[PDB]
Structures are given as structure tokens and as C-alpha cells.
């Protein structure tokens, strides 16, 4: 298969279904370490603007507490690789990508379908 053809088809589809006005950023963390006395050193972060489509909004319940939060899935093209553990901000609220399922038929990811979960929400 001409995976390049599949890649361009997927990119055009994602561009078709996306909304340019929605601002989405990708945040990745740097190296972490510990000093000689046992304490840690905080890691640096980098912000990379991205764009894509979303799907499946889902709510969350915590033992009946009145805490409001939501979870969401997304679709992205093959421009910036999205490893698990990164942070993606949909519209200001930060989401952590628990799982980033790629289209799995080749070496390049072709496309990403990350599973985004709302961050700083208790169990």
C-alpha cells in the first residue's frame, strides 16, 4: 500500500473535520533528576501548538461529591508525535493523554487518536 496516499488522505480528513478557531497546545516535559542530598529538581516544559478534532465528551462522578469534570477523545494528524503522559489543553483546561492509539500499519504513526483525561481530578 502507498502509505503516503493513506497519510495524505488522513491529513485531509482531519483538516476537514477540524475547527481552526479552537486553540490547542501540546505540553511536553524535560529531564528529571535528584540532587546528592535526596531532594529533586523540577523538570522543564515545552509548549507546542497543535490542531485537530475531538469526539465523545464524557462526565465524571466522585463518590457523590459535587465536583464537575469531563473527559474527551481527540483525533490528530502526523505532525508532532504524541507519547503517553503528555499534557494537551483543549480550550484552557489541561488534559493528560493516558493512551494515544496510533493508526498501526507502518513505522510512521500515520495518525493519532489520543484518549484525553481531565487532570487534577481526584479518584
Amino acid at each position: 500500500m502507498n502509505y503516503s496516499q493513506i497519510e495524505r488522505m488522513a491529513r485531509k480528513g482531519v483538516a476537514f473535520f477540524t475547527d481552526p478557531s479552537r486553540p490547542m497546545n501540546l505540553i511536553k516535559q524535560g529531564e528529571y533528576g535528584y540532587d546528592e542530598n535526596g531532594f529533586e529538581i523540577p523538570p522543564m516544559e515545552q509548549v507546542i501548538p497543535i490542531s485537530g478534532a475531538t469526539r465523545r465528551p464524557n462526565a465524571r462522578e466522585i463518590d457523590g461529591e459535587t465536583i464537575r469534570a469531563s473527559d474527551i477523545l481527540g483525533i490528530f494528524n502526523n505532525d508532532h508525535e504524541i507519547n503517553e503522559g503528555d499534557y494537551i489543553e483543549i480550550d484552557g483546561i489541561r488534559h493528560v493523554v493516558v493512551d494515544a492509539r496510533p493508526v498501526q500499519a507502518s513505522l510512521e504513526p500515520v495518525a493519532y487518536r489520543p484518549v484525553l483525561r481531565r487532570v487534577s481530578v481526584g479518584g
Binding site: 465536583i67 487532570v119 481530578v121
Partner: protein, 129 residues
């Protein structure tokens, strides 16, 4: 008398950490947008002992739980510093507006999840009538 006891506990916490993002019972709360460290305030009731024969001498005991919630991935040192800060403000034998502290604050074991971690901190109160 759990009314006034919870009122006093809420008074104290608000006095020191009013600015810090926090959750109060039965009010619609939204976790911070950027994702950070908020505080969950919970008040758990207890028993009322009958320490008399006339049946007119009773005391009330309640448990207050403050939970530090922080995002996953950052690391666990700041949460422990905040827990120490809370524990050093709720010492034993402290006279609130009504009642006193029967036992101090004990930092407990972390409760883990894939969307946030929490470190429970709890203490007790008592009123004698």
C-alpha cells in the same frame, strides 16, 4: 452541637487558606483549569458519649479531613510540604471558637489514580456540655 463545631472548623481553615483553591461541601466546584493543587475539605461525624447517670452530661466527637490533591507527573515533594504546613497549624490542644482539638493532624498514605493523587490529612475535635 455538630453545627457549631463544623462552623468553627470551617472558620479556622478559611482563615488561613481562604485564597488557596478549595472545595466546600455541597457546593458546585470546578477544578483549576491549568491543573494544580486544590484542597478538599470534608467533615465526618462521630459518636456522642453519655458520661453520666443523670443523662445530662454528654460530649460530641467529629473527624475533619483535609485532602491535598495534585496532578500526576509533577512529583511528590510539594504535596508533602503542604501537608506539613497544614499539620503544623492544627496542633493538639488548640482552642477554636467553640470546642477544642482532641487529637492532632496525622499525614496518611497517598491514594493514587491516573487523573490525580491525594494525601489525606485528618484531625479530631471535641465539645463537652
Amino acid at each position: 452541637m455538630h453545627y457549631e463545631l463544623s462552623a468553627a472548623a470551617r472558620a479556622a481553615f478559611l482563615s488561613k487558606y481562604r485564597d488557596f483553591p478549595h472545595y466546600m461541601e455541597n457546593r458546585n466546584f470546578t477544578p483549576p483549569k491549568d491543573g494544580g493543587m486544590w484542597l478538599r475539605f470534608n467533615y465526618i461525624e462521630g459518636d456522642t458519649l453519655y458520661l453520666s447517670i443523670d443523662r445530662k452530661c454528654k460530649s460530641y466527637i467529629a473527624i475533619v479531613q483535609i485532602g491535598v490533591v495534585f496532578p500526576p507527573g509533577s512529583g511528590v515533594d510539594e504535596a508533602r510540604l503542604k501537608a506539613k504546613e497544614i499539620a503544623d497549624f492544627f496542633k493538639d490542644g488548640k482552642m477554636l471558637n467553640v470546642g477544642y482539638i482532641f487529637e492532632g493532624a496525622i499525614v496518611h498514605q497517598i491514594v493514587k489514580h491516573e487523573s490525580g493523587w491525594m494525601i489525606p490529612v485528618r484531625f479530631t475535635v471535641r465539645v463537652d456540655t
